[PDB]
Amino acid sequence: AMLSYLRAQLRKAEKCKLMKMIIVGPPRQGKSTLLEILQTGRAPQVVHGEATIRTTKWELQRPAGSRAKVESVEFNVWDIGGPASMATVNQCFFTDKALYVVVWNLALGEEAVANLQFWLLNIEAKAPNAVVLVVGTHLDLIEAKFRVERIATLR
Ligand SMILES: Nc1nc2c(ncn2[C@@H]2O[C@H](COP(=O)(O)OP(=O)(O)O)[C@@H](O)[C@H]2O)c(=O)[nH]1
């Protein structure tokens, strides 16, 4: 560790805050809508294409109460989808030491959740040391009055 640290100092090492973001899920779940609203904080406005892959960049400022050591973080955002025929292909794009987010529709509920195992396994097969979040969309389609006892159950 001492030699690695001394090499970092000697080789004028800089702090890299850029990281990999991957968006995963079955077709028609709101991956692009997810990325859009998270980037902008507004209701979606963009009509997104049919391309299997969409690439962009995203900066996040630290929220109030954050104890982080960085003012902000940056993500080189990949979003892979498209026809299921290329699913076997898309498996190659998963890597380790990257952030994953799986997108699924809450309205389908358990029907979607079962399928999640497939996608989840596909990440752990090629990303043992990666953090993957899983997010349910279409929360507006869940009745607010029942919402808690629904979402917790689904969780
Ligand atoms: N009402 C509602 N619609 C959503 C929500 N999240 C995503 N969508 C829908 O998802 C669509 C975008 O899906 P998209 O990401 O292009 O599907 P993809 O083919 O899997 O990439 C939009 O037309 C939205 O109507 C949500 O929270 N509420």
UniProtKB/Swiss-Prot annotation:
To which species is this protein native? Homo sapiens (Human)
Q: Where does GDP bind?
A: P27, R28, G30, K31, S32, T33, G49, E50, H138, D140
Which portion of the complete protein is shown here? Answer: 621 to 775 of 2015
Q: How is it modified after translation?
A: Autophosphorylated. Autophosphorylation is inhibited in its dimeric state.
The transmembrane residues are none
Q: What is the annotated localization of this protein?
A: Cytoplasm; Cell membrane
Disease association reads: Osteosclerotic metaphyseal dysplasia: An autosomal recessive skeletal dysplasia characterized by osteosclerosis at multiple skeletal sites, predominantly at the metaphyses of the long bones and vertebral bodies.
Its subunit composition reads: Homodimer. The homodimer is autoinhibited and stabilized by its N-terminal residues and ANK repeats. Interacts with CSK.
Report the function annotation for this chain.
Answer: Serine/threonine-protein kinase which phosphorylates RAB proteins involved in intracellular trafficking. Phosphorylates RAB7A; this activity is dependent on protein kinase C (PKC) activation. Plays a role in the negative regulation of bone mass, acting through the maturation of osteoclasts.
Q: Which domain of life is it from?
A: Eukaryota
Residue ranges constituting the Roc domain according to the UniProt record = 12-155
Could you say which protein family the record assigns here?
Belongs to the protein kinase superfamily. TKL Ser/Thr protein kinase family. ROCO subfamily.
Q: What is this protein called?
A: Leucine-rich repeat serine/threonine-protein kinase 1
